[PDB]
């Protein structure tokens, strides 16, 4: 298939959606809700881009680059102001509620969210009312739970549940106060819970065994192993 | 721990600017020359002094929504309190 | 901790009879559970899911997604009084002003002796007819703040 | 006016009413014409000979959109292979302002099991479901009644009137939230799940309840259908002379005369429904503002008054006609306290899937209690424009964010002066810190 993206012609696969396909090109959107593994929803709202009907459209539409298939003669724009700002604005909404935490944060310096905070260009707060909190629930010995970093963005749920099949992590409640988490206290049974931990990009569940001996990220020495 | 190699530092500041809690900062006292350069690395009980130093009200933990002891959830500066996801309020 | 009864049981797996799915029974079996005991205690969630088949965070998800499915202990009577915005033209602060004077709580509150519980509740579908209220089953409408004393005690 | 006739030409849905707003049971409602129209629908009419028959009478959907019923028929698939088709009545009905479903479940509900039993002859659909709020304890009764007098009559079970068609309905009553009347959420609740709904493509149509085909329509549609097969197509366009074809059941509500719902043909202007049958505002009270369609839509002035009650026509004047069952706010009335409570309730009917509405209504409902203190800041207004901007159409996931912020531009844009008002704080959201001299921002 074949896109222009601010002008420039790209050849992208037809049966892949918008989003996938820029970010394979090196084009940078920010996005939340979507993982290469678990498929596209539209949850989070932050993937925003300009669509236009045909090379002689001004106008355009905000549409959402992870629900929208990236098929021939597709026109959209990912600098263009109205999308900016968008995306600036779901960045900021997220960032209403959310804990001033980041120096006691295991994600710090690994964070998904503090990369697309930075990228959409967002640092000046103008909302000066409260933030909502939430209890934490204990995991077990491996993940740490801190349910006040969330930006309910329905990742874990998505994977822990329709992906690794497990059954007792779930989303709980209604409006802004969503919960991700146990119906009660008590340790996550699936084999494959360790991977909260890089599916959140917040600092929502995160490793336990390294929070014992945390260092961030820049200060590790790396090795490809097995 | 915390320790600081003072015969390597050149005393730039950077630290103090960077501090999010404003733990480390940089005081008017210049008085540090040493016999030996293993006694300029400074350990954390020769650098936690017993009071705020230039920045006398600041504490990052009244504002984090980590709780600690003495700070539930919810007590921190601009947060509402807990409300529990099986509240009878719609 | 919890057992459901027999006739609690029997109203669910006759509800799974009606649906492709049996997850689709969910919201009447906490329905179920919560007109047999007043809300849905802690135990019923994994009881529910148990019949069903379902996992109890689908259940618990379902239980805390609906307003009107009570997580915590409730008064006998529920009332719930419209919030809504033809409500509030036609003056639904003043009974919620009487309410709250005469059982001496807050929307969200039960009485010290577990008689009532006063919630808010979003449009109750009679705006022409408003203020509107809800004890347990009936509705009330044409409400005034003089009647609120009169209209609770029918309610012991 | 006191003086309606209903008569079954002009007033097909509401003309065997009883005085006593007692339920018309089903040897009462058989007396007045009662299942002629599904009897010629399933003795004389091929299922997509009543689809076509229902998309040339030009019926739209009543739950406020205003989606062509047949259209919506019409998308069913062809393919045999997909034949557990299920039919939907959106008897949820949560919107503010709206209570029109509550009367035609309450004392007409054969005239619902009549239009499900026809509409399910037409979609071939095998089951179906009356998704019905939980407040409306005396429509679950009515229709549960009413179900049962309909099976036990024969007009409901195995072999409906000698056809082979098998049809069994059922009324599943909710659990108190909003967005379960969304159609995609309609259909979340319906299988047990959280009602989150559904992105669209695919639409129900062809991948709806369970993955089966899927039909939602609300309950005046279902109603409306009896009446088009008893009677024809051209009966139901020569009983208004407008684009929108056939009557619709409006009224105005809130500090009126005669508060109420009467049945009238599209065209009909809000004036005359305001002054005749709700009779003007009450005594000492000035007519401010209107909403003609419910909780969802932007407010109009005196000067729309005059306007008919169309989709097009209040669609051209910046709202939308909505449900129809358009709220007076007088003089006496705070706007800011309006908007405040409607977004208030806007935001926490919010189901949280999507962030546009899920954190960003509770910041307009913070602003709305700050202006409504007089503890607003400058930013407020310009913050309330940029969020009404940006909860728009395509923006959230699903239309009850849209909806949401539509009064609270309109109100923004007409009474600006008491959102003006509002603010009397000079803006801050930073205290001192000792040691650090702050960045002043010119
Ligand atoms: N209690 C009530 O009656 C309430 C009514 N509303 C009204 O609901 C409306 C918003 O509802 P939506 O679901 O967003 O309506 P919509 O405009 O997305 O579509 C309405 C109907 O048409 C169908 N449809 C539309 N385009 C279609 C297409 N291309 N292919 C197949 N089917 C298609 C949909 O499936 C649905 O059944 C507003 O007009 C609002 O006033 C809103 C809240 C409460
Ligand atoms: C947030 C939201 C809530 C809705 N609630 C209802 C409702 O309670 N009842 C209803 O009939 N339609 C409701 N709708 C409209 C439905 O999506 C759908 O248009 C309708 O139920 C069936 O279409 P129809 O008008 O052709 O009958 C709602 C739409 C939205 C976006
Ligand atoms: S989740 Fe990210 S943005 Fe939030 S406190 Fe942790 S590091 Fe900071
Ligand atoms: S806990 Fe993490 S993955 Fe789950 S919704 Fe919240 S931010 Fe997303
Ligand atoms: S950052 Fe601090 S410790 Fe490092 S050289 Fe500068 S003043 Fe010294
Ligand atoms: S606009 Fe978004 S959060 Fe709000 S009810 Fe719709 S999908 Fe849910
Ligand atoms: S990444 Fe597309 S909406 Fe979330
Ligand atoms: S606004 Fe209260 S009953 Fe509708």
Same mark, same amino acid.
């Given at each position: 298939?074949?896109? &222009?993206?601010?002008?420039?012609?790209?050849?992208?696969?037809?049966?892949?959606?918008?989003?996938?396909?820029?970010? @394979?090109?090196?084009?940078?959107?920010?996005?939340?809700?979507?993982?290469?593994?678990?498929? @596209?929803?539209?949850?989070?709202?932050?993937?925003?881009?300009?669509?236009?009907?045909?090379?002689?459209?001004?106008?355009?539409?905000?549409?959402? @680059?992870?629900?929208?298939?990236?098929?021939?003669?597709?026109?959209?724009?990912?600098?263009?102001?109205?999308?900016?700002?968008?995306?600036?604005?779901?960045?900021?909404?997220?960032?209403?509620?959310?804990?001033?935490?980041?120096?006691?944060?295991?994600?710090?310096?690994?964070?998904?969210?503090?990369?697309?905070?930075?990228?959409?260009?967002?640092?000046?707060?103008?909302?000066?009312?409260?933030?909502?909190?939430?209890?934490?629930?204990?995991?077990?010995?491996?993940? @740490? &739970?801190?349910?006040?970093?969330?930006?309910?963005?329905?990742?874990?749920?998505?994977?822990?549940?329709?992906?690794?099949?497990?059954?007792?992590?779930?989303?709980?409640?209604? &409006?802004?106060?969503?919960?991700?988490?146990?119906?009660?206290?008590?340790?996550?049974?699936?084999?494959?819970?360790?991977?909260?931990?890089?599916?959140?990009?917040?600092?929502?569940?995160?490793?336990?065994? &390294?929070?014992?001996?945390?260092?961030?990220?820049?200060?590790?020495?790396?090795?490809?192993?097995? | 721990?915390?320790?600081?190699?003072?015969?390597?530092?050149?005393?730039?500041?950077?630290?103090?600017?960077?501090?999010?809690?404003?733990?480390?900062?940089?005081?008017?006292?210049?008085?540090? !020359?040493?016999?030996?350069?293993?006694?300029?690395?400074?350990?954390?009980?020769?650098?936690?002094?017993? !009071?705020? !130093?230039?920045?006398?009200?600041?504490?990052?933990?009244?504002?984090?929504?980590?709780?600690?002891?003495?700070?539930?959830?919810?007590?921190?500066?601009?947060?509402?309190?807990?409300?529990?996801?099986?509240?009878?309020?719609? | 901790?919890?057992?459901?009864?027999?006739?609690?049981?029997?109203?669910?797996?006759?509800?799974?009879?009606?649906?492709?799915?049996?997850?689709?029974?969910?919201?009447?079996?906490?329905?179920?559970?919560?007109?047999?005991?007043?809300?849905?205690?802690?135990?019923?969630?994994?009881?529910?899911?148990?019949?069903?088949?379902? $996992?109890?965070?689908?259940?618990?998800?379902?239980?805390?997604?609906?307003?009107?499915?009570?997580?915590? $202990?409730?008064?006998?009577?529920?009332?719930?009084?419209?919030?809504?915005?033809?409500?509030?033209?036609?003056?639904?602060?003043?009974?919620?002003?009487?309410?709250?004077?005469?059982?001496?709580?807050?929307?969200?509150?039960?009485?010290?002796?577990?008689?009532?519980?006063?919630?808010?509740?979003?449009?109750?579908?009679?705006?022409?007819?408003?203020?509107?209220?809800?004890?347990?089953?009936?509705?009330?409408?044409?409400?005034? $703040?003089?009647?609120?004393?009169?209209?609770?005690?029918?309610?012991? | 006016?006191?003086?309606?006739?209903?008569?079954?030409?002009?007033?097909?849905?509401?003309?065997?009413?009883?005085?006593?707003?007692?339920?018309?049971?089903?040897?009462?409602?058989?007396?007045?014409?009662?299942?002629?129209?599904?009897?010629?629908?399933?003795?004389?009419?091929?299922?997509?000979?009543?689809?076509?028959?229902?998309?040339?009478?030009?019926?739209?959907?009543?739950?406020?959109?205003?989606?062509?019923?047949?259209?919506?028929?019409?998308?069913?698939?062809?393919?045999?292979?997909?034949?557990?088709?299920?039919?939907?009545?959106?008897?949820?009905?949560?919107?503010?302002?709206?209570?029109?479903?509550?009367?035609?479940?309450?004392?007409?509900?054969?005239?619902?099991?009549?239009?499900?039993?026809?509409?399910?002859?037409?979609?071939?659909?095998?089951?179906?479901?009356?998704?019905?709020?939980?407040?409306?304890?005396?429509?679950?009764?009515?229709?549960?009644?009413?179900?049962?007098?309909?099976?036990?009559?024969?007009?409901?079970?195995?072999?409906?009137?000698?056809?082979?068609?098998?049809?069994?309905?059922?009324?599943?009553?909710?659990?108190?939230?909003?967005?379960?009347?969304?159609?995609?959420?309609?259909?979340?609740?319906l299988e047990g799940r959280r009602a989150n709904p559904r992105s669209k493509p695919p639409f129900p149509a062809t991948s709806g309840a369970w993955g089966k085909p899927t039909c939602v329509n609300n309950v005046e549609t279902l109603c409306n259908v009896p009446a088009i097969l008893a009677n024809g197509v051209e009966?139901?366009?020569?009983?208004?002379?407008?684009?929108?074809?056939?009557?619709?059941?409006?009224?105005?509500?809130?500090?009126?005369?005669?508060?109420?719902?009467?049945?009238?043909?599209?065209?009909?202007?809000?004036?005359?429904?305001?002054?005749?049958?709700?009779?003007?505002?009450?005594?000492?009270?000035?007519?401010?503002?209107?909403?003609?369609?419910?909780?969802?839509?932007?407010?109009?002035?005196?000067?729309?008054?005059?306007?008919?009650?169309?989709?097009?026509?209040?669609?051209?004047?910046?709202?939308?006609?909505?449900?129809?069952?358009?709220?007076?706010?007088?003089?006496?009335?705070?706007?800011?306290?309006?908007?405040?409570?409607?977004?208030?309730?806007?935001?926490?009917?919010?189901?949280?899937?999507?962030?546009?509405?899920?954190?960003?209504?509770?910041?307009?409902?913070?602003?709305?209690?700050?202006?409504?203190?007089?503890?607003?800041?400058?930013?407020?207004?310009?913050?309330?424009?940029?969020?009404?901007?940006?909860?728009?159409?395509?923006?959230?996931?699903?239309?009850?964010?849209?909806?949401?912020?539509?009064?609270?531009?309109?109100?923004?844009?007409?009474?600006?002066?008491?959102?003006?008002?509002?603010?009397?704080?000079?803006?801050?959201?930073?205290?001192?810190?000792?040691?650090?001299?702050?960045?002043?921002?010119?």
């Amino acid at each position: 298939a074949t896109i &222009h993206v601010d002008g420039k012609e790209y050849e992208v696969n037809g049966a892949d959606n918008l989003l996938e396909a820029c970010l @394979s090109l090196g084009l940078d959107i920010p996005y939340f809700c979507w993982h290469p593994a678990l498929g @596209s929803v539209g949850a989070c709202r932050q993937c925003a881009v300009k669509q236009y009907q045909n090379a002689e459209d001004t106008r355009g539409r905000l549409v959402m @680059s992870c629900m929208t298939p990236a098929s021939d003669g597709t026109f959209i724009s990912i600098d263009d102001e109205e999308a900016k700002q968008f995306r600036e604005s779901v960045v900021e909404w997220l960032m209403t509620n959310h804990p001033h935490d980041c120096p006691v944060c295991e994600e710090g310096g690994n964070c998904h969210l503090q990369d697309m905070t930075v990228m959409t260009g967002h640092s000046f707060r103008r909302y000066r009312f409260t933030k909502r909190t939430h209890r934490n629930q204990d995991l077990g010995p491996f993940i @740490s &739970h801190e349910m006040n970093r969330c930006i309910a963005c329905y990742r874990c749920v998505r994977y822990y549940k329709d992906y690794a099949g497990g059954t007792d992590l779930g989303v709980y409640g209604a &409006h802004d106060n969503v919960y991700f988490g146990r119906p009660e206290d008590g340790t996550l049974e699936s084999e494959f819970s360790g991977n909260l931990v890089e599916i959140c990009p917040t600092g929502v569940f995160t490793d336990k065994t &390294h929070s014992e001996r945390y260092n961030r990220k820049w200060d590790m020495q790396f090795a490809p192993s097995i | 721990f915390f320790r600081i190699n003072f015969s390597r530092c050149i005393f730039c500041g950077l630290c103090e600017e960077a501090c999010p809690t404003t733990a480390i900062q940089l005081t008017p006292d210049f008085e540090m !020359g040493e016999y030996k350069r293993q006694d300029l690395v400074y350990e954390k009980e020769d650098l936690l002094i017993s !009071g705020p !130093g230039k920045y006398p009200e600041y504490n990052f933990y009244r504002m984090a929504g980590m709780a600690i002891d003495g700070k539930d959830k919810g007590e921190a500066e601009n947060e509402a309190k807990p409300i529990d996801v099986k509240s009878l309020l719609p | 901790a919890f057992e459901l009864s027999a006739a609690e049981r029997e109203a669910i797996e006759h509800e799974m009879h009606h649906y492709e799915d049996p997850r689709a029974a969910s919201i009447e079996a906490l329905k179920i559970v919560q007109k047999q005991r007043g809300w849905v205690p802690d135990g019923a969630i994994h009881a529910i899911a148990d019949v069903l088949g379902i $996992p109890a965070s689908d259940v618990e998800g379902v239980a805390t997604f609906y307003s009107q499915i009570f997580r915590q $202990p409730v008064g006998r009577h529920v009332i719930r009084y419209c919030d809504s915005v033809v409500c509030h033209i036609n003056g639904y602060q003043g009974i919620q002003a009487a309410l709250e004077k005469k059982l001496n709580i807050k929307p969200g509150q039960t009485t010290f002796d577990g008689r009532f519980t006063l919630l808010p509740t979003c449009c109750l579908g009679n705006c022409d007819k408003g203020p509107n209220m809800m004890i347990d089953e009936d509705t009330h409408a044409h409400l005034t $703040p003089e009647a609120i004393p009169e209209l609770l005690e029918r309610y012991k | 006016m006191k003086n309606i006739i209903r008569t079954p030409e002009t007033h097909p849905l509401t003309w065997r009413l009883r005085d006593d707003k007692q339920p018309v049971w089903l040897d009462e409602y058989r007396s007045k014409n009662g299942y002629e129209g599904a009897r010629k629908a399933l003795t004389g009419l091929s299922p997509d000979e009543i689809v076509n028959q229902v998309k040339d009478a030009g019926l739209k959907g009543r739950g406020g959109a205003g989606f062509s019923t047949g259209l919506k028929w019409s998308l069913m698939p062809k393919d045999e292979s997909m034949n557990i088709r299920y039919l939907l009545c959106n008897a949820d009905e949560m919107e503010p302002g709206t209570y029109k479903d509550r009367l035609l479940m309450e004392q007409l509900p054969h005239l619902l099991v009549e239009g499900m039993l026809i509409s399910a002859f037409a979609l071939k659909a095998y089951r179906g479901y009356i998704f019905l709020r939980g407040e409306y304890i005396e429509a679950a009764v009515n229709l549960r009644r009413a179900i049962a007098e309909a099976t036990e009559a024969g007009l409901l079970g195995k072999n409906i009137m000698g056809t082979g068609f098998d049809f069994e309905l059922f009324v599943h009553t909710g659990a108190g939230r909003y967005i379960c009347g969304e159609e995609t959420a309609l259909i979340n609740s319906l299988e047990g799940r959280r009602a989150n709904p559904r992105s669209k493509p695919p639409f129900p149509a062809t991948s709806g309840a369970w993955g089966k085909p899927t039909c939602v329509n609300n309950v005046e549609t279902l109603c409306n259908v009896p009446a088009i097969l008893a009677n024809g197509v051209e009966w139901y366009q020569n009983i208004s002379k407008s684009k929108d074809a056939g009557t619709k059941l409006m009224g105005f509500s809130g500090r009126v005369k005669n508060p109420g719902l009467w049945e009238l043909p599209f065209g009909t202007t809000a004036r005359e429904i305001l002054e005749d049958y709700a009779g003007g505002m009450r005594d000492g009270l000035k007519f401010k503002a209107w909403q003609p369609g419910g909780a969802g839509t932007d407010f109009l002035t005196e000067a729309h008054l005059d306007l008919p009650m169309e989709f097009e026509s209040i669609g051209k004047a910046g709202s939308r006609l909505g449900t129809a069952l358009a709220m007076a706010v007088d003089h006496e009335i705070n706007m800011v306290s309006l908007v405040r409570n409607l977004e208030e309730f806007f935001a926490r009917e919010s189901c949280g899937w999507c962030t546009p509405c899920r954190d960003g209504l509770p910041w307009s409902v913070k602003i709305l209690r700050a202006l409504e203190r007089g503890e607003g800041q400058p930013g407020d207004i310009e913050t309330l424009e940029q969020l009404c901007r940006f909860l728009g159409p395509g923006k959230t996931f699903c239309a009850h964010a849209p909806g949401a912020v539509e009064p609270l531009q309109s109100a923004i844009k007409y009474f600006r002066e008491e959102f003006e008002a509002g603010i009397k704080q000079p803006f801050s959201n930073t205290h001192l810190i000792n040691g650090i001299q702050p960045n002043l921002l010119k």
